[PDB]
Every structure is written in C-alpha cells, then in structure tokens.
C-alpha cells in the first residue's frame, strides 16, 4: 500500500540498509547485463550459423 519504510535520499545512502543494499545489487545486475549483451552479440568475431536456412521456427509453427 506504500505507506512507509526506509527511503534513501540518494544513491550513496543505499548502503545504510541491507534491503536497499540487495536492491542496488539487483539494479546493478539488471543494468549491467545490457552492456554485456551489447559486447557479446555485436562482437566482430560473431558469425551467423551457416545452416541457419536449413530450419527455422517460422516454418515449424506455419
């Protein structure tokens, strides 16, 4: 019902309560996974599967 509880004023205060510490850890995971996907899935050495035209979900569900 969002009535009350500890509310950090800014980022630096997230370490003043264990629950908000876990919350900021989770936020870091969430936001840092995206750059990892950028680096991994836009890599120069990434190569499409040669047999990608052999089969696809589009023909399966059709």
């Amino acid at each position: 019902m969002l009535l009350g509880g500890f509310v950090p004023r800014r980022f630096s205060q997230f370490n003043r309560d264990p629950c908000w510490m876990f919350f900021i850890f989770s936020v870091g995971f969430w936001l840092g996974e995206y750059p990892a996907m950028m680096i991994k899935y836009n890599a120069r050495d990434l190569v499409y599967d040669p047999h990608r035209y052999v089969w696809s979900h589009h023909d399966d569900h059709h």
């Binding site: 019902m1 969002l2 009535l3 009350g4």
Partner: protein, 139 residues
C-alpha cells in the same frame, strides 16, 4: 526502550476512520492507535496518512494485585483453546510449512526437469497406466 511491535493498525489513520470514536484522544488531539491511552501518538503523511505510536519508558501508578477470586473465571471447556496456545500451535505449524515450501520451491525451480523434452535428455515422455493384467479373456 525495546524494538517490539504494538497493537496493529492496518496502515490506517484513526482520526478519520469509521470507528475513530473507539480510539481515545490525547491532549495533543491525536487519537490512539489502540484502545489503550497513548500520550505520544503521531501521524505521518505518505501518499496516505497513517497513525503511529512509539513505545517509551513511562511510569504508571500500579494498583496493588487483587485476589484471584475476583478476576479468575474457571469456565474452561475441553474445546476451549487460549489465544496463546493457538499462537504457539500456529507458529510451529507455519514453521514446518515454511520448511516444506522452501524445499518444494528449491526442487521445482532448480532440480525438477520439465516433461517431454525435445532432446529426450531430461524429463519423462509419459507412459500408460491401469493396463489390464492377467485377463486373457479381455482380448
């Protein structure tokens, strides 16, 4: 003073509730969070207003202990279970239920394989049951 809880409020403001009259009002004009008398009751304003009571060390003139005759009522019945006993029972039951649910959650979301896998490496593909046995005349 201790960190213990108090009479529950449900996140409601007693100065505007439908049963506000049941909550005593102190000198400052703040109705109590409980049927008891509270001197330091306060109101906090989030999106919704809610009443709060902060426990404190206060001395109250304690009337001398009466006799057991004038407050004890020995009308207990076999079916009767006291609130304290009920709380104990429920605490134990919920502890065991919590352990069981924790085990179940772990097994489901980290160990139990999904049925009917494409590769066949994990999970069962299903099978028949209730098949007849020792009934040659059936065929």
């Amino acid at each position: 003073v201790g960190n213990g809880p108090t009479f529950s409020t449900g996140g409601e403001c007693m100065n505007t509730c439908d049963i506000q009259n049941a909550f005593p009002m102190n000198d400052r004009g703040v109705r109590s969070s409980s049927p008891f008398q509270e001197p330091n009751t306060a109101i906090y304003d989030s999106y919704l207003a809610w009443t709060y009571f902060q426990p404190m060390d206060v001395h109250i003139e304690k009337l001398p202990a009466p006799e057991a005759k004038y407050y004890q009522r020995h009308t207990k019945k076999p079916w009767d279970v006291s609130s304290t006993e009920l709380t104990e029972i429920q605490s134990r039951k919920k502890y065991f239920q919590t352990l069981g649910y924790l085990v179940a959650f772990i097994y489901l979301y980290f160990l139990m394989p999904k049925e009917k896998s494409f590769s066949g490496l994990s999970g069962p593909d299903g099978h028949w049951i209730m098949l007849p046995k020792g009934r040659p005349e059936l065929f």
